[PDB]
Structure 1
Amino acid sequence: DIAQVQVQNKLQLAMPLLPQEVQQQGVSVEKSSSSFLMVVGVINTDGTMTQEDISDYVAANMKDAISRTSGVGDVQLFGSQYAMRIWMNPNELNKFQLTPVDVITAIKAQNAQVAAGQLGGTPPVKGQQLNASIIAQTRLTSTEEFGKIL
Structure 2
Amino acid sequence: KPGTDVEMAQVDVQNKIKAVEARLPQVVRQQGLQVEASSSGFLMLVGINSPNNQYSEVDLSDYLVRNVVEELKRVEGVGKVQSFGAEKAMRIWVDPNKLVSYGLSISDVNNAIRENNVEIAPGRLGDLPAEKGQLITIPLSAQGQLSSLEQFKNISLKSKTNGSVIKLSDVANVEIGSQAYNFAILENGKPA
Q: Report TM bin, short chain.
A: 0.7 to 0.9
Distance apart, 1:16 and its partner CA: 5.1
Q: CA RMSD in A?
A: 2.3
CA gap of 1:113–1:20, structure 2 versus 1, over 3 A, is: farther
Partner of 1:85: 91
The equivalent of 1:138 in structure 2 is 144
User: What is aligned with 2:40?
Assistant: 34
SS of 2:78's equivalent?
A: coil
3-state SS in 2 of match to 1:135: strand
Stretch of structure 1 that moved more, 36-45 or 46-55: 46-55
Structure 2 residue aligned with 1:3: 9
Q: Distance in 2 between matches of 1:85 and 1:120?
A: 40
| Percent of aligned pairs with the same amino acid | 44
Aligned-residue offset at 1:84: 1.3
Give the Cα separation in 2 of the matches to 1:149 and 1:16. Answer: 39
Q: Which moved more, 1:116-125 or 1:136-145?
A: 136-145
Answer yes or no: is the 8 Å Cα contact 1:31–1:74 preserved in 2. Answer: no
**Across the two proteins, how many residue pairs are aligned to each other?**
150
Question: Deviation digits for residues 125-150 of structure 1, max 9, x if unmatched?
Answer: 12223201221243322222221222
Return the alpha-carbon distance in structure 1 between the equivalents of residues 22 and 94 of structure 2. Answer: 31
Q: Does 1:124 align with 2:135?
A: no
Match of 1:105 among 77, 100, 111: 111
TM-score of the two chains, using structure 1 as the length reference? 0.83
Q: Which has the larger radius of gyration?
A: 2
CA offset at residue 11 of structure 1? 3.6
Give the counterpart of 2:75 among 69, 80, 88.
Answer: 69
Q: Which runs of 5+ in 2 are unaligned?
A: 1-6, 157-192
Q: Which amino acid aligns with 1:74?
A: K
In 2, Cα distance between equivalents of 1:82 and 1:71: 28
Distance between the aligned counterparts of 2:30 and 2:88, measured in 1?
A: 17
Letter in 1 for 2:123: G
Once structures 1 and 2 are overlaid, which stretch shifts more, 20-29 or 61-70? 20-29
Cα deviations by residue, 1:10-55 (Å, 9 ceiling, x for unpaired): 5455445444544554642222110111111211123611121101
Bigger mean CA deviation after superposition, 123-132 or 84-93:
123-132
Which shows bigger deviation, 95-104 or 66-75? 66-75
Please identify which structure carries the higher strand content.
2
How far apart, CA to CA, are the structure 2 residues paired with 1:133 and 1:75? 39
